């Protein structure tokens, strides 16, 4: 009999450490009365969708039902006052949140000929190596100490949760497949999600490597005309700077008896017409004062 | 995908037919397994397609 | 080799110069504006197709 | 890659010895061509990348 | 790498410690210099990356 504890778009996927910190400092009231407690423990939940602070105050319905008790660890608060550590330890339904009373109806039916039941976690298995290698979302090193040949998964639901955690799916997607029974069904739901989640995952990272591939393409098509472009500089252009602006003034300006204050002014601008750029309005305005 | 008790039930027909007979049955009926699960894939593709298009541009627009 | 690569990269713009060029065919036209246009075309092919800069020159070209 | 000239000039050859020589001939001077081509095109892409790294080598001063 | 001038000052050392302690120093210089080398080469290759990748959000913030 505790209040709800304030999520906050801190989802809290099963068998998956994650930290919760709430900006009102209430709930510091609740943790510090706990402490106390012999077996310290914080109850876990999941929002419903149009998230909103007074609502969770307000009413007690827009909390889901699911809930996933756990132990609390330790008290850190480096930065914020309110740091809490919340696993996923023991997932629980509440009939009524309303009316507390809880009941550990966790149900993991499952066949007695278990010769085929394991051959979806290898596809599944293949999978989330295909998705975290082409969107890597975490270190390799967890997919190496939980491997399925080790034997070691005395909780395979557990590793399928997790396996599925690494999804990008929205909270309602995951409260879907919680409200699944069925193994099956929940299994299926978890990797056709992973797919989605990772197309679109996919679709964000391909638009940036696209830029890379439009640059490199317009630098080759003007690397191919760079080298028509150097034949043509040694043949076309002839390496001579005759007929040019520069030339092209200097000869307009040769036939001129002229005085020496103009020929250091336009050598200035001759050599700011050098330096800058042809394209640049500056460029356009210093010819123009040239000519 | 047979199970492995399958592929000892079919190596335990000795007859060439009666064995080729057993391996048609467990095709057909992987087969049948494979159709369904595709037509269920399908239909709950179908059922996630009914999301609106209008929910795919709020996430390019994001 | 030289020619064939003059023709290789013989539109400034994709669709653009040729268009402009014969569009200039039918004019009876000043030595200025023909140079300048030659300028502006060349900046055009130095320039990317969908830079600012280049959309200006392209408004100014039309 | 030669002409259709070279190879009517080939095909009018009657001696084995006279087509299969103008054959080779002409193979030797396709690698002629291609690697006229890939030399220009190398030594540009050393100077281009040349000219890259100059501002690279500005931006090492810096 | 060091100078012939280190080399000689080593080879005017007679005590077989002081010469091996003063190729060590040596050793530890030219160490020094191109750690120095590579750390600054790294760091100019990894900030004209940057830029490009910078060239590209840029496309982004557009």
């Known amino acids: 009999h505790l209040p709800l504890i304030a999520i906050t ?11 919760i910190e709430v900006k009102n400092k ?13 077996q310290p423990y ?6 419903r969708d149009d998230s909103n602070e007074s609502d969770v105050v307000e009413s007690l319905d827009e909390i889901y039902h699911t809930g996933t008790f756990a132990q609390i660890h330790e008290m850190q608060d480096l930065g914020d006052k309110l740091r809490m550590i919340v696993m ?12 507390m009373v809880e009941v550990e109806n966790v149900v993991h039916e499952d066949f007695q000929v278990t ?54 799916a929205e909270s309602h997607e995951l409260q879907d497949v919680l409200e699944e029974t069925n193994i099956p069904k929940r299994l299926y739901k978890a990797l056709s999600l992973l797919k989605k989640e ?11 490597r696209e830029v890379e591939e439009k640059i490199k393409q317009t630098h080759r098509k003007e690397l191919l005309q760079e080298q028509l472009k150097i034949i043509k500089k040694e043949l076309g252009l002839e390496k001579d700077d005759k007929d040019a602006i520069e030339e092209k003034f ?17 050598d ?24």
């Open 9 to 19: 778009r801190n989802p809290v996927f099963p068998r998956f450490i994650k930290i």
């Open 26 to 38: 209430k709930l510091v009231e609740l943790l510090r009365r706990k402490v106390r407690l012999a």
């Open 42 to 47: 914080v109850g876990v939940f999941l929002k």
């Open 88 to 99: 996923g330890h023991r997932r629980v339904h509440i009939s009524r949140q309303l009316e």
């Open 115 to 168: 010769e085929e039941v394991k051959a979806l976690t290898a596809e599944i298995v293949k999978t989330i190596r295909d998705i975290i290698a082409l969107n890597p979302l975490y270190r390799e090193s967890v997919l190496q100490m939980m491997q399925a040949g080790q034997r070691v998964v005395d909780n395979p639901i557990y590793l399928s949760d997790m396996g599925a955690a690494l999804t990008g």
């Open 198 to 208: 990772f197309e679109l995952s996919k679709l964000q990272q391909r638009l940036g």
């Open 250 to 266: 200097r000869e307009r300006l040769k036939e001129l008896v002229v005085p020496k204050h103009v020929m250091d002014v336009v």
């Open 268 to 291: 200035e601008e001759l050599s700011k017409l050098g330096l800058l750029d042809n394209h640049s309005s500056e460029f356009n305005v210093t010819r123009n004062y040239l000519d």
